[PDB]
Amino acid sequence: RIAALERNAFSVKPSLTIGYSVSRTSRNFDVDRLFPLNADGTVANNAFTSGGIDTDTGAQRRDFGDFGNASDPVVAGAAGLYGFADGVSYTVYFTDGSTATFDGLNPADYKVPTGKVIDTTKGRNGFGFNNLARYKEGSTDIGIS
Amino acid sequence: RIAALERNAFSVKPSLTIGYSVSRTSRNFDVDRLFPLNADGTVANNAF
Amino acid sequence: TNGNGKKDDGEATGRGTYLGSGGTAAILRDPAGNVYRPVFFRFKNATTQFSVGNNPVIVTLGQQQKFYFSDYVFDNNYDGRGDGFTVTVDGSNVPVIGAWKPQIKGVYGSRSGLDGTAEAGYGVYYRGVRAQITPVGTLTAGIHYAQEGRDMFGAAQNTTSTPSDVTTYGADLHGKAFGVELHSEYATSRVRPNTANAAVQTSNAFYARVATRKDNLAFDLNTPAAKFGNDTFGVSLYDLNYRKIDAGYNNVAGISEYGYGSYSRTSAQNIAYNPDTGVTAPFANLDRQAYTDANNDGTSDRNADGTVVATNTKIGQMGFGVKAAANLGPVAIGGYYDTSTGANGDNANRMTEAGGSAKVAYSIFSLRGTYNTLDSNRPQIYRDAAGTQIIGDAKVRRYAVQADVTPGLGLFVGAYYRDVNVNGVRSTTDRGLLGRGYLASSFEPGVGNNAYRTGLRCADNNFGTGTRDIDGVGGVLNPAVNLDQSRTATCFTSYGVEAGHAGDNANALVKDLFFRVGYSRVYVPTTATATTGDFSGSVTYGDARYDRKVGVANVRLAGSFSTTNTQLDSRPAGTRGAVGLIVRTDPLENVPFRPQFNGQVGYYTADNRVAAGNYNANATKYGAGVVLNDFLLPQTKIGVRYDGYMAQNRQYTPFDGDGTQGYFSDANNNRRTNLNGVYVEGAYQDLIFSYGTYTLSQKDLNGVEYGSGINNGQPARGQTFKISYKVNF
Amino acid sequence: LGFDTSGQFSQVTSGTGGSLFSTAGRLQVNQIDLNFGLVTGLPSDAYVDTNGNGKKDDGEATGRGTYLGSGGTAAILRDPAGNVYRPVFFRFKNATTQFSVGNNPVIVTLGQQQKFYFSDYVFDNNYDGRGDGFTVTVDGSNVPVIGAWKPQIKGVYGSRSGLDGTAEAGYGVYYRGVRAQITPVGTLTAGIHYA
């Protein structure tokens, strides 16, 4: 009878997560490229990584920023610090109220305004600026499941 | 093993409420100010 | 909401359908402080096949039936075709005929199950039968029939282009019989391609290959399968085949998911074996490539990078090929042949590759000689002398002699003189042409090692040309990359010598030590394309690697060097050094606190003389760190780690989104990255405090400090503090 | 109908953790005060808090109006055969927000809404709590040389209001402090504190 009871009995598993975390940055660069590589080619473990290991897209922990609660992928060229930080990524305003995002260090080079829209001078000269600082206010969180 | 079963077992508790009630008024006044007051100041229990 | 099983454009965000299930956006609460969450019934069902019957007859019912009669007919595994049933009958116990192991398979199904109109699998049903025996030792002979067609609700209201009916016959003779190993296959297409007048189309696919087939149905051209003698007179056939794949045999003709096309068009292009899509197909349906010239008229269209856009026209395949090797005593010889015409038989698509080699080995000396040809009248896409991709006839004639001596102490020396000759001109490098055939088959150094193994050893006794590395320093701080094993895999008209040493060989001078000093000279034409030229290029390289464990520490030294004068593959011309040290001690159970030290140093220097500058590109990575395993209170651990990475004109390119990863490289960006950082990690019993401060600055030559790109002359900074605690109920 | 649980899930044992190293794990047991179970139907006052404030704002959800058939007489999910269906929710109450580790001299406490009190006029921060963070207390009342004076050291760190939006008084403001006290004579406790 005990076997019949335990055949269709529920194993209840509660899980609790406790943790405090604060992070302040101004560019959200990547730090995983500083840590020693293990003998099997994987970077050593730290408490600051954003993760992101993917074998389908070839992503690695070194391709993503590690500060704030953002995992902003690192940008090549002069937008990012030549593959070391996040891109500048101005924003562009349009007459019809729509907006788009230019990814470059010089907004004058925005060679693709779509045919029917015009840059309304709403930003500095119609070109805004996506803020580069990320912040995670200090807070300890308890997660129950 | 019975203790391990009891550790993560559900106590199923149902409940049933049966009751009939009809009430007719024209002003909806109060009647709790008529009942005797007990020793600690609480109004005596009533069904209304 | 579509049944496709995939998240389409903005379906539900299920957490948004059932508010309170998760996240912070919605939380179903109570004023008293209770929190309510919906309870869902989760289930994963991986079983989709049900089999009935025990020995003789087994009937399988289910979705996405994966079945496989034979290659070129129902290579339908690896996805399955549709929903239905599959009966298998095993007559391995019939009294009179049970030693031949007869087997009868019968498949029926509906393609893709139930699916909407305008999909390829609407109203299409497939049927098939196969009969198999083993009359002799292992030769399975089988005959099969396979039809796939449209019913009355598919002939109309289907669109697509799925043929009205397709009907395939076949026969196969795979197996090993009397020390020989045959592999034959036949087919017949009979496609009725919808439309109105039908005009049934016929296509055949036949081959008779005598070789060794691995269990994954790939062909092993390194095992003889004939072996007409012992180790003193040991003539051994390796392959003898024939091909008659018609032009019209695609994955629709023989009813399969994928395949019947060249796998690479740059590697062996006669073989259609595709491990990616599960296409077992020993021979390919070749195609005729040509210039596009679509929009503008007069010039051939090219992509943005410069590679040519080509138009492909299926031609089929017809030809034979033989590979054998006669193992004598101290000497051994071998040869191969192959001629892949088109199906029609025109010599406008012939690709003939001949060759042969001979190795004489005795004591500690070995001397090889190899001659390789490739006379391809098929177009072929390859770079010309200048460096622009072109499409046209190719004619390569290579010959190389190598001399390897192994003193016995783990040492090895080797001289080589390789001479490539493309289209008459001496061609400083073959442009990948020699790898267009599946029978390359060079020999191997060492005595008692007479194996005629496929693949030209053009990556043997040559230098390295890798300019990409995982870590900031030149791949020398990576304990997973052996720099001394970095070869170029590109055949050169060169000559040179290479000493070396190995540490896994016993009776070595130094136990686990490796180095690869070497010198070589590469032929270059005079100007760009002239026949005249001189062996004026010079490559001088050498790498080293040494682990050891001196005491409690684990040292690891590595180093590299290269002094080329020419653009070899992608490496620019200049001196290139790199040195790396990785120290890793273990806990010291004698000194108090039981510390556990660490360390890492790496220096890299490269003087790139590109066609637009002579810039120096160097980098330096350092790293320390001490972990005290017993700090005052019991179960208290502290740990600190300082890192850092300086770099002149070097850059990092992230992952491309495909399998390719990111890598560091040399650019002419006049910027000096100075990534830094300190990382403190203390731990009480199980409560971990992690503090970390990092700074990134990229000054240009002037010192403008472009980091923190609001352009205020300040480095980018980051800082983090985490208190972590893992609890279990 | 209600499914209550045996309520034997009141302890949590810590686990191994760390990056530069690996702690032993299973070293401290914490008494949690979790009270959970399965309810079938929402109460009258349940609401979907779409803010994070934790209180019912103007027209949030009336949770009975979100999951129709949970309760009340407005919506009755039923069947012609006479069956009545009600969603099954998992209710839980968490009163534990403080986790303390360490045994004799040093106790380190992590949690939300830390309550601490250095002295009147400095950190009279009890009765509500100041913010989210940690608090270390060191009791040196067993050190050989100085154990008759009962020296103690408190240290507090945290972020005000925990995680809060802009225009609130606690956005990006952090507090810290340390106090040291002794009892040289019978009961006189002398303390010095910084905050």
mmCIF file of C-alpha atoms in Angstrom, chain A residues 3-144:
data_model
loop_
_atom_site.group_PDB
_atom_site.id
_atom_site.type_symbol
_atom_site.label_atom_id
_atom_site.label_comp_id
_atom_site.label_asym_id
_atom_site.label_seq_id
_atom_site.Cartn_x
_atom_site.Cartn_y
_atom_site.Cartn_z
ATOM 1 C CA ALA A 3 4.217 1.623 -2.857
ATOM 2 C CA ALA A 4 0.786 2.373 -4.326
ATOM 3 C CA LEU A 5 0.697 5.651 -2.392
ATOM 4 C CA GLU A 6 4.155 6.693 -3.573
ATOM 5 C CA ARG A 7 3.460 5.661 -7.171
ATOM 6 C CA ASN A 8 1.086 8.592 -7.655
ATOM 7 C CA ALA A 9 2.359 10.983 -4.981
ATOM 8 C CA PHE A 10 3.691 14.483 -5.581
ATOM 9 C CA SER A 11 7.257 15.347 -4.637
ATOM 10 C CA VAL A 12 6.978 18.986 -3.594
ATOM 11 C CA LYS A 13 10.138 20.989 -4.288
ATOM 12 C CA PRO A 14 10.287 24.618 -3.150
ATOM 13 C CA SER A 15 13.152 26.811 -4.281
ATOM 14 C CA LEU A 16 14.383 30.034 -2.716
ATOM 15 C CA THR A 17 16.910 32.499 -4.134
ATOM 16 C CA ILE A 18 18.453 35.234 -1.984
ATOM 17 C CA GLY A 19 20.853 37.841 -3.252
ATOM 18 C CA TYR A 20 22.062 41.447 -3.230
ATOM 19 C CA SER A 21 23.622 43.173 -6.221
ATOM 20 C CA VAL A 22 24.580 46.713 -7.219
ATOM 21 C CA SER A 23 26.330 47.765 -10.418
ATOM 22 C CA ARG A 24 27.381 51.165 -11.731
ATOM 23 C CA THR A 25 28.986 51.754 -15.122
ATOM 24 C CA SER A 26 29.250 54.426 -17.789
ATOM 25 C CA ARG A 27 30.016 52.500 -20.995
ATOM 26 C CA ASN A 28 29.229 48.832 -20.265
ATOM 27 C CA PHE A 29 32.414 47.238 -21.628
ATOM 28 C CA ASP A 30 33.511 43.610 -21.266
ATOM 29 C CA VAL A 31 35.857 42.132 -18.656
ATOM 30 C CA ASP A 32 35.745 38.401 -19.421
ATOM 31 C CA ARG A 33 38.783 38.810 -21.690
ATOM 32 C CA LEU A 34 40.992 39.526 -18.662
ATOM 33 C CA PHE A 35 40.484 36.313 -16.711
ATOM 34 C CA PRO A 36 42.731 33.259 -17.108
ATOM 35 C CA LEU A 37 41.731 30.615 -19.615
ATOM 36 C CA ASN A 38 41.261 27.106 -18.274
ATOM 37 C CA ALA A 39 43.049 24.114 -19.771
ATOM 38 C CA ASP A 40 39.973 23.342 -21.903
ATOM 39 C CA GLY A 41 39.778 26.811 -23.455
ATOM 40 C CA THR A 42 36.930 28.146 -21.307
ATOM 41 C CA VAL A 43 37.385 31.403 -19.418
ATOM 42 C CA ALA A 44 37.681 31.206 -15.645
ATOM 43 C CA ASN A 45 34.625 31.833 -13.511
ATOM 44 C CA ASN A 46 33.765 35.180 -11.948
ATOM 45 C CA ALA A 47 30.711 36.764 -10.331
ATOM 46 C CA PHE A 48 30.475 39.588 -12.888
ATOM 47 C CA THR A 49 29.949 37.738 -16.165
ATOM 48 C CA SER A 50 26.790 38.306 -18.180
ATOM 49 C CA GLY A 51 27.037 34.803 -19.619
ATOM 50 C CA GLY A 52 26.007 34.304 -23.211
ATOM 51 C CA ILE A 53 27.870 31.172 -24.313
ATOM 52 C CA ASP A 54 26.244 30.037 -27.559
ATOM 53 C CA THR A 55 27.586 27.481 -30.014
ATOM 54 C CA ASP A 56 24.886 28.098 -32.623
ATOM 55 C CA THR A 57 25.798 31.779 -33.037
ATOM 56 C CA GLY A 58 29.417 31.395 -31.948
ATOM 57 C CA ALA A 59 28.850 33.772 -29.049
ATOM 58 C CA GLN A 60 31.128 33.725 -26.015
ATOM 59 C CA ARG A 61 31.255 35.393 -22.621
ATOM 60 C CA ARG A 62 33.784 37.876 -24.041
ATOM 61 C CA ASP A 63 31.293 39.285 -26.583
ATOM 62 C CA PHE A 64 28.948 40.860 -24.024
ATOM 63 C CA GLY A 65 29.254 43.661 -21.503
ATOM 64 C CA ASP A 66 29.320 42.744 -17.843
ATOM 65 C CA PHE A 67 28.021 45.732 -15.849
ATOM 66 C CA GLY A 68 24.562 46.844 -14.887
ATOM 67 C CA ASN A 69 21.717 44.477 -15.682
ATOM 68 C CA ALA A 70 22.448 44.868 -19.397
ATOM 69 C CA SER A 71 24.362 42.481 -21.634
ATOM 70 C CA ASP A 72 24.947 44.995 -24.417
ATOM 71 C CA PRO A 73 26.948 43.115 -27.075
ATOM 72 C CA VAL A 74 30.331 44.636 -27.806
ATOM 73 C CA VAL A 75 30.616 46.615 -31.052
ATOM 74 C CA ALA A 76 33.442 46.544 -33.588
ATOM 75 C CA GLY A 77 34.835 49.575 -35.377
ATOM 76 C CA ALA A 78 35.109 53.052 -33.883
ATOM 77 C CA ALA A 79 31.545 53.011 -32.531
ATOM 78 C CA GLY A 80 32.571 50.602 -29.843
ATOM 79 C CA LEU A 81 36.103 51.029 -28.569
ATOM 80 C CA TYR A 82 37.329 48.782 -31.384
ATOM 81 C CA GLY A 83 35.616 45.698 -30.044
ATOM 82 C CA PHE A 84 35.977 46.526 -26.356
ATOM 83 C CA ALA A 85 32.779 48.365 -25.376
ATOM 84 C CA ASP A 86 29.256 49.295 -26.459
ATOM 85 C CA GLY A 87 28.518 51.369 -29.540
ATOM 86 C CA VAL A 88 27.535 55.016 -29.535
ATOM 87 C CA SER A 89 24.236 54.570 -31.404
ATOM 88 C CA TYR A 90 22.649 57.979 -31.880
ATOM 89 C CA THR A 91 18.883 58.123 -32.358
ATOM 90 C CA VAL A 92 17.166 59.931 -35.238
ATOM 91 C CA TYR A 93 13.809 61.716 -35.125
ATOM 92 C CA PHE A 94 11.417 61.969 -38.064
ATOM 93 C CA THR A 95 8.626 64.294 -39.163
ATOM 94 C CA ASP A 96 5.908 61.642 -38.853
ATOM 95 C CA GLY A 97 6.783 61.153 -35.179
ATOM 96 C CA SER A 98 8.614 57.897 -35.862
ATOM 97 C CA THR A 99 12.220 57.380 -34.809
ATOM 98 C CA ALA A 100 15.115 55.154 -35.825
ATOM 99 C CA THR A 101 18.590 54.337 -34.488
ATOM 100 C CA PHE A 102 21.851 55.267 -36.203
ATOM 101 C CA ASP A 103 24.862 53.195 -35.127
ATOM 102 C CA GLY A 104 27.967 55.303 -35.612
ATOM 103 C CA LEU A 105 30.314 57.788 -34.013
ATOM 104 C CA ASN A 106 29.348 60.567 -36.457
ATOM 105 C CA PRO A 107 25.647 61.275 -37.091
ATOM 106 C CA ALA A 108 26.425 63.347 -40.192
ATOM 107 C CA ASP A 109 27.122 60.064 -42.007
ATOM 108 C CA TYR A 110 23.501 58.902 -41.698
ATOM 109 C CA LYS A 111 23.104 58.033 -45.382
ATOM 110 C CA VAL A 112 19.773 56.215 -45.076
ATOM 111 C CA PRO A 113 16.895 58.550 -44.262
ATOM 112 C CA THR A 114 13.941 56.618 -45.653
ATOM 113 C CA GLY A 115 12.548 58.370 -48.725
ATOM 114 C CA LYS A 116 9.375 59.804 -47.205
ATOM 115 C CA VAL A 117 10.652 60.995 -43.810
ATOM 116 C CA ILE A 118 12.595 64.117 -42.825
ATOM 117 C CA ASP A 119 14.675 64.693 -39.699
ATOM 118 C CA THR A 120 12.714 67.079 -37.493
ATOM 119 C CA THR A 121 15.145 69.226 -35.528
ATOM 120 C CA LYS A 122 14.114 67.851 -32.119
ATOM 121 C CA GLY A 123 17.423 66.624 -30.685
ATOM 122 C CA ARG A 124 20.658 68.554 -30.828
ATOM 123 C CA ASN A 125 19.996 68.940 -34.572
ATOM 124 C CA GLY A 126 17.374 66.222 -34.909
ATOM 125 C CA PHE A 127 19.870 63.580 -33.765
ATOM 126 C CA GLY A 128 19.422 62.437 -30.195
ATOM 127 C CA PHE A 129 21.850 60.416 -28.101
ATOM 128 C CA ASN A 130 21.254 56.995 -26.575
ATOM 129 C CA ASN A 131 22.669 57.234 -23.062
ATOM 130 C CA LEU A 132 25.635 54.955 -22.462
ATOM 131 C CA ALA A 133 25.437 54.528 -18.681
ATOM 132 C CA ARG A 134 23.832 51.477 -17.090
ATOM 133 C CA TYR A 135 22.783 51.294 -13.457
ATOM 134 C CA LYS A 136 21.297 48.640 -11.186
ATOM 135 C CA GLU A 137 20.186 50.223 -7.928
ATOM 136 C CA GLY A 138 21.237 48.317 -4.841
ATOM 137 C CA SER A 139 18.525 45.858 -3.879
ATOM 138 C CA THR A 140 18.471 42.383 -2.393
ATOM 139 C CA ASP A 141 15.883 40.158 -4.036
ATOM 140 C CA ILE A 142 14.119 37.040 -2.760
ATOM 141 C CA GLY A 143 12.655 34.723 -5.366
ATOM 142 C CA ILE A 144 10.292 31.934 -4.337
#
